């Protein structure tokens, strides 16, 4: 994703991340 950080290429909290 794009918006905030976390999991997916391109670091966005999507699915249950970290």
């Known amino acids: ?3 905030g950080w976390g ?3 391109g670091v966005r ?3 249950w991340c970290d």
């Open 7 to 9: 999991f997916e290429p």
């Open 13 to 15: 909290c999507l699915i």
């Open 1 to 3: 994703g794009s918006r």
